[PDB]
């Protein structure tokens, strides 16, 4: 007997017609579109197409009610209590409609999907209420826009609106079109948990909404969806000062060794067919077996996918639901009927808006189909002989989101994790998920994290704000010859180059005196410094104290020659440059310090074992120096990411290079690897761009304008970009640690 | 050819007969006694016996010199960082020196112990740098008073010395009377450092300078050594306000599974043996082998074992060195001709102060060699048949500091770590150290921890002090009966008890109003508490999610009840009690908060894989409150203690029990598990030293008085002990967590 639906019914035939939730109340319906229950082709519900008029009362409702909301922790985390409390009392609701909304089996929807929904409110509610006492340096960001996708909605809502209410925030989010309802119901119980009206705002539509809050006067937005929607996002958002997240799904590798436990991966991946949809954070689609073990494991998968149930979505014992919408039915249909390789095999599957499981097996590492975008319940498989091939097979995709690794030696597991490119990798396990652990993407997968600590400075900015210096126009001279040899060059893989379009500025001091000249670097000197740092990704793998002791160098060796560089200052500027030198020689000491103590995080999980949040570096990054502070800027933006494992290329202040290139030396001085800091001089209107589109670096930090050209130039590869503010003058180091950081957690066993 | 000592001799020579090093500069030569080179009997140098006045002396320099010390942390790190270069430097000269003055091997010197003590002066620099901003809540503590041993004596002092130096501390150091020469070359290299006068003292001599420095006007005394000077110290300090942290041994148990990697475990057990002496974190010496590989480990160790070259512990091919000192030599013997279990097999040995690797196999679990400290170069071993028996066998000690296990299982070894009750467990190895890494011990192997972030709070203190209230007396009345069934009992094992003695007094109001009677507990109420407690232990196993959720019942019930909990502080106080009501249920949702989200520390080291600083629970804790706050208080003290795990029994405010008498109700409407909150009331003098005193408690919070009867009493099982300040209206929760959590270093492969 399938579960009844019965009250599900009762509630939007209460519901009616819907319009909006906005300001605390259900706006008039207005121009409708039907949701279809998609396993009986039903409409559900008709629902309002959003107008730009409703986007914008959303977001003035948000902001009237955001200063209040924000000034008292303790309350906003009585409301999550109480909005968790609603989703436990009313979990059979809430399951039975995602199930007739989006398709999927009732026995996820019940198991899964609201459990870990009640649970995100739970665990956020304490954030609140630790907030002011321990995130004191950090305040709310105001108002978020949020745009989740189909394949999880009360999720995908559940992991939007706790954390951003959590930190003070309040929140326009608007729901896939196709998955409405229980985003709906979500508003339909704000009420009762004491949300104050206009502390949450549902509004629904298809992309056309999306964009219009996206561009809205939003403080931050939040979006969970395609890569491509993800990069317009970028775009439509660059140099707004708008804070940025972006979960751009890519299904992970599922990487089984030799000697792992065949029957429980098997059934791991089997239990993950019907999961690993649409862009949620999964691993599995994408299956790399040892070539020992591969033949066995491809036939008991094969009967395992035989076993899996496929029928009526409200039915407990059925584990393939109906795909959401004919739309994705097509798409399904469409990439298995543009493939040529392999060998496909599908189970039975019954009429309908039903597709079966299906394995495209026999494929070679380069085939295609390993690199696409995989959709519907498919995966696709290859073999490989060494663990090292396995990392190289794993990585060889534009993604970088979870993975997992089946190994039953305790050695071979804990190797492989931290050389997979992913936000996360799972341990003879798939598909972990939990409030406290954070979950969130690389490269084409995004930028951000959801869950846990790390999850919530997103969520925020500092308390007290700081400002970038303006810009400082480069002093002008009469423009005699030099009969001296004062040219500074470029200092790229570790040692000085001439500039490859081979142009010089003379520099001046502020009467006009010719200091010297300075280099004009190009997009071919970037592309070298940028070979420089590829070739220098062994700095990326050193042990936090061989990094101290490179940083406790340069600041000796800098400290050696502090008069020199003051009076460099002063020649440039004609202000003393005693406490600019000091200041830089104090940023070198406090990198060093922290290079092997930043620690990653242990979160207890209610489910097996640990989830470990490791550091990691970026890799490799791009940075445009201010004008001001033509030494502490450099040395302060260089010092914590190098002390973080990154290689860095810098841009120095483009009105006063000559502290820079003084600099050479004390990096040559100090033994810094080759290509793990690379120093160009110059135009930043030549170099900003490049540096932004450059689709081997893997952030930009631009703190010297050209905010908007950067952030969407970064959508190219969707690096991490930061455009400020920075202020030399200011102590930014514990900051700084976090933009030249990703967090990998890692789901290992532990009693 | 063995190193050349010529160096060493001349330092030696320079020095002539020593004196102390006190406010920067050496001492003039005393009362003087050898320190003679155990491998050639030869007197290596006159050092002096300290007086009382040599202390004096030591202890007035440190604290003069303390407050410019303390005021500039990039000073401290400059200095600190000097050391590490000077170590370096001169790494051959201690390493040398060491070897002399002990007798052990010089590869071990020369590759182990001045290698770590480098990296720990390099390593804590970092903190001394980043203590102000990272750290702005704590100050230093201001003179420390620190005894070390005889078996790592530069290591010791590295160990003691960086953290207190790094957090702007001075010191007071005494090294062992057998190995005086590496401390007394680390003082004539402070001067070189730029050490100010009297940051540094080092003062020479046996127990009794010991005990004078123990006694001294110090702010804090750290001791490693053995377990019965740990309680003497802890006797000779109890009342005083110092801080304590104490290492006291017990050598760790060395589990070997049927899946271990045989070859690797053998290996690192020999290569163990000579390291594995005195008072340090170790784990070797209590060897448990799985019946099935028992008999092959064992016809493999004892082969290895006969590899071990013993000899001129000069010579670096050497692996067993001399005996520190023929009363240790005598103490081996003795241990050995004490013992009949077992089968005692020893290597071949050379004549003198040599004592050869011997194993004693063959016993069993129950036997005294497997519990008895061991001395020397001795393993015991026994065998187990299921991993849950090798965990009874492990933890059946009065010891607890580190432990190894061997398994090539991914799922067993990390299933086994937890289980083992230690502040170190290392996974396929043993013996693994790092600055980052925090060790120490729990049970009778001590308390507090040194290393990592951990290992500073102890030499700090808050940065604005606290007071706790002074005591109230209890309201007297007329004595008139009651008529009304008004005698509040106790709560123990989730249930309202009879006190064992059947005495209760009559509680009155302000102005003499009879409100009821409150019962006296007796020693027996504790102990029917304690079982209670144990009864409970399921509660330190439970998840975080869990004791969240039982928390937020907590601060919902009482909020349910909150104006009937103000009505009864004011009967008993005279004062409003609202603002203690709501302070109370805040302090409840902030441990709420807490329960799910106070994480471990992941440690990058520059060994094989990571350290995982977890954290665990405490135990049993006993907590006496103070009279004011009649709930808060006690709210205060038990939901931080219960949201780490603990079980806890709290004697209520002795002067206004009856807020915690009618807590009993919110505990059992809470489904609070019977025994993880038991409440006592009562007068403190019948209950402090019982509670501080029993050998079933973990630790005891005396918030009401007492401290040098509970501190004191105390040194009985070595629980932890916390006397305070605590002041009920402060927000003391993030504090408390630390007085209510352990930390267990667990060190796992990671690539
Ligand atoms: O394709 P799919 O449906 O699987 O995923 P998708 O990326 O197209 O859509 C995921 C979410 O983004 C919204 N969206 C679509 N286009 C958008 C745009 N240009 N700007 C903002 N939001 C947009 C969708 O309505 C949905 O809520
Ligand atoms: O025996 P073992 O020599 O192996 O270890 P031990 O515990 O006796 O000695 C370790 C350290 O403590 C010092 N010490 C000894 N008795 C002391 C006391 N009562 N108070 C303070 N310090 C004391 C020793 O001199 C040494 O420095």
């Not at 209460?14 to 409708?32: M, Q, R, S, V, Y």
């Not at 993604?399 to 341990?427: C, Q, T």
């Not at 396990?429 to 954070?438: E, H, R, S």
């Not at 905010?707 to 970064?714: F, G, K, N, P, R």
Request: charged content about 20%.
């Amino acid at each position: 007997a399938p579960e009844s639906a019965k009250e599900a019914y009762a509630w939007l035939a209460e519901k009616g017609d819907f319009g909006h939730f906005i300001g605390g109340a259900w706006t008039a319906p207005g121009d409708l579109f039907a949701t279809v229950n998609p396993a009986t082709g039903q409409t559900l519900a008709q629902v309002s197409q959003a107008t730009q008029a409703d986007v914008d009362a959303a977001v003035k409702a948000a902001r009237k009610a955001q200063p209040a909301w924000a000034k008292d922790g303790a309350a906003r985390a009585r409301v999550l209590y109480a909005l968790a409390r609603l989703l436990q009392k009313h979990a059979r609701l809430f399951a039975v409609l995602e199930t007739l909304d989006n398709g999927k089996p009732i026995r996820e929807a019940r198991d899964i999907d609201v459990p870990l929904a009640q649970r995100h409110f739970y665990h956020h509610a304490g954030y609140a209420q630790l907030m002011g006492t321990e995130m004191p340096d950090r305040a709310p960001l105001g108002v978020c826009g949020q745009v989740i996708p189909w394949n999880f909605p009360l999720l995908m809502l559940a992991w939007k609106i706790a954390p951003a209410l959590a930190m003070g925030n309040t929140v326009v989010l608007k729901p896939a079109e196709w998955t409405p309802l229980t985003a709906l119901l979500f508003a339909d119980i704000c009420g009762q948990a004491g949300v104050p009206a206009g502390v949450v705002n549902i509004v629904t539509g298809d992309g056309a909404v999306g964009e219009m809050i996206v561009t809205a006067q939003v403080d931050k937005v939040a979006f969970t969806g395609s890569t491509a929607v993800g990069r317009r996002i970028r775009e439509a958002t660059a140099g707004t000062g708008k804070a940025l997240s972006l979960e751009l799904g890519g299904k992970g590798p599922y990487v089984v060794c030799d000697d792992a436990d065949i029957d429980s991966a098997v059934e791991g991946l089997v239990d993950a067919i019907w999961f690993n949809q649409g862009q949620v954070c999964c691993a599995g689609s994408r299956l790399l077996v040892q070539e020992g073990i591969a033949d066995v494991f491809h036939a008991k998968l094969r009967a395992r996918m035989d076993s899996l149930r496929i029928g009526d979505p409200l039915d407990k014992c059925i584990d393939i639901g109906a795909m959401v919408h004919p739309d994705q039915l097509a798409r399904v249909r469409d990439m298995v009927a543009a493939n040529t390789d392999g060998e496909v095999y599908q189970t039975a599957v019954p009429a309908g808006c039903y597709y079966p499981p299906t394995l495209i097996s026999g494929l070679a590492p380069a085939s295609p189909l390993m690199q696409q975008e995989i959709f519907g319940p498919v995966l696709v498989s290859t073999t490989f002989r060494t663990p090292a091939e396995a990392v190289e097979i794993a990585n060889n995709t534009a993604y970088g989101l979870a993975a997992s690794v089946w190994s039953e030696n305790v050695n071979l597991a804990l190797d492989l994790a931290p050389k997979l490119v992913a936000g996360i990798v799972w341990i003879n396990g798939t598909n972990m998920m939990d409030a406290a652990a954070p979950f969130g993407g690389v490269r084409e997968s995004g930028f951000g994290r959801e869950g846990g600590w790390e999850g919530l400075a997103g969520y925020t900015r500092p308390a007290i704000a700081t400002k970038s210096p303006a810009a400082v126009a480069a002093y002008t001279g009469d423009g005699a010859a030099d009969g001296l040899d004062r040219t500074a060059k470029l200092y790229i893989g570790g040692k000085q180059t001439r500039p490859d379009g081979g142009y010089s500025r003379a520099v001046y001091g502020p009467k006009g005196k010719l200091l010297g000249h300075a280099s004009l670097s190009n997009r071919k000197d970037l592309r070298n410094a940028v070979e420089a740092m590829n070739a220098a990704s062994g700095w990326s793998r050193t042990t936090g104290h061989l990094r101290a002791q490179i940083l406790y160098f340069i600041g000796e060796n800098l400290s050696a020659r502090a008069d020199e560089f003051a009076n460099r200052i002063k020649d440039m500027t004609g202000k003393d440059g005693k406490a600019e030198v000091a200041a830089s020689i104090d940023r070198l000491f406090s990198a060093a310090a922290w290079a092997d103590k930043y620690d990653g995080q242990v979160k207890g999980v209610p489910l097996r074992g640990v989830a470990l949040a490791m550091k990691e570096p970026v890799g490799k990054i791009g940075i445009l120096c201010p004008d001001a502070a033509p030494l502490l800027g450099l040395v302060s933006l260089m010092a914590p990411a190098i002390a973080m494992g990154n290689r860095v290329t810098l841009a120095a202040s483009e009105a006063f290079p000559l502290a820079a290139t003084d600099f050479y030396q004390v990096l040559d001085t100090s033994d810094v690897p080759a290509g793990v800091v690379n120093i160009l001089t110059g135009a930043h209107a030549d170099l900003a761009e490049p540096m932004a589109r450059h689709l081997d670096l893997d952030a930009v930090w631009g703190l010297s304008g050209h905010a908007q050209v950067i952030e969407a130039a970064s959508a190219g590869n969707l690096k991490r970009s930061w455009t400020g503010p920075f202020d030399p003058a200011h102590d930014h180091t514990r900051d700084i640690l976090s933009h030249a950081t990703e967090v990998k957690t890692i789901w290992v066993p532990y009693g």
